[PDB]
């Protein structure tokens, strides 16, 4: 990891945190494969998610992480859910020069697949067989292990 | 603390409440977010009313219900209060909420 100091500038390569030794499943192609974490992480698992996110909440490049695309989409979606739920106070977006928050109340949300900004209200709910469905969760996480008798209801 | 309730998914912007006064042009449709802004306690009351049985006794039960937007409660109500009930949903912890010891315990999966 290189950081640049600044015209005359100097770039110093600094020590990077190392992964804990002895992964539970060595020789795994992807770190999730290496750690047997394919179907055991959720958006609430911020500790794992934070490692793959930029300091201000941006997504880190896939190539640097080295994880497979399937986990990349899952991890990105989980992080997106955490941000919309306000679960990443230290990774909030950077205010460019002097901007300040609108100071209006923020509604508490979780399990948000899409941004609330771009979702229109549903005026017509429909009847028993014409009822409109409200998306809950993300399709990318269908394969996750389920401890319930029946599969979770994606659409509410 | 009804002001601080949490709605799963995009229910804040997707759920619409429709009411009709019964007079011409009396149809009113309000989004959940708009309804909460107008009244934090209205949404909680509406959900309970719908869940309650559609009988004459429902109105009487609503009278016995007490909804407070914030932590403030009358002292006499506290004396009347006998027991408090555990929160139905366990609240996920934020980054700050996580303890320092927990951070040490958690391993660093990958090295940048």
């Amino acid at each position: 990891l290189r950081e640049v100091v600044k015209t005359v500038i100097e770039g110093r390569i600094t020590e990077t945190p190392k992964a804990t030794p002895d992964p539970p499943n060595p020789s795994g192609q992807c770190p999730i494969c290496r750690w047997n974490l394919k179907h055991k992480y959720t958006y609430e698992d911020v500790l794992l998610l934070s490692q793959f996110i930029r300091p201000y909440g941006g997504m880190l490049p896939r190539r640097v992480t080295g994880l497979c695309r399937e986990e990349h989409r899952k991890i990105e979606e989980c992080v997106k859910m955490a941000h919309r739920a306000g679960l990443l106070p230290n990774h909030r977006p950077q205010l460019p020069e002097g901007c300040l928050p609108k100071d209006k109340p923020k509604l508490n949300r979780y399990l948000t697949r899409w941004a609330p900004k771009s979702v229109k209200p549903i005026y017509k709910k429909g009847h028993r067989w014409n009822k409109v469905g409200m998306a809950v969760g993300s399709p990318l996480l269908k394969d996750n292990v389920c401890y319930s008798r029946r599969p979770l209801k994606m659409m509410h | 603390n009804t002001r601080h309730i949490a709605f799963s998914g995009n229910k804040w912007e997707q759920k619409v409440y429709s009411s009709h006064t019964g007079y011409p042009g009396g149809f009113r449709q309000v989004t959940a977010a708009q309804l909460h802004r107008k009244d934090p306690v209205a949404i909680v009351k509406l959900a309970i009313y719908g869940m309650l049985p559609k009988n004459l006794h429902r109105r009487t039960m609503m009278q016995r219900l007490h909804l407070f937007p914030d932590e403030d409660i009358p002292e006499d109500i506290l004396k009347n209060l006998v027991e408090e009930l555990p929160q139905p949903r366990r609240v996920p912890k934020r980054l700050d909420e996580y303890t320092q010891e927990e951070i040490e315990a958690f391993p660093r999966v990958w090295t940048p």
Binding site: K40, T42, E44, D45, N144, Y147 | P107
Partner: peptide, 21 residues
């Protein structure tokens, strides 16, 4: 980390808690 080690998470452990008779 020992073999067959899974860090505890929401989905790693079952909701029910094991008991010892």
């Amino acid at each position: 980390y020992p073999q067959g080690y899974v860090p505890k998470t929401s989905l790693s452990s079952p909701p029910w808690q094991e008991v010892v008779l």
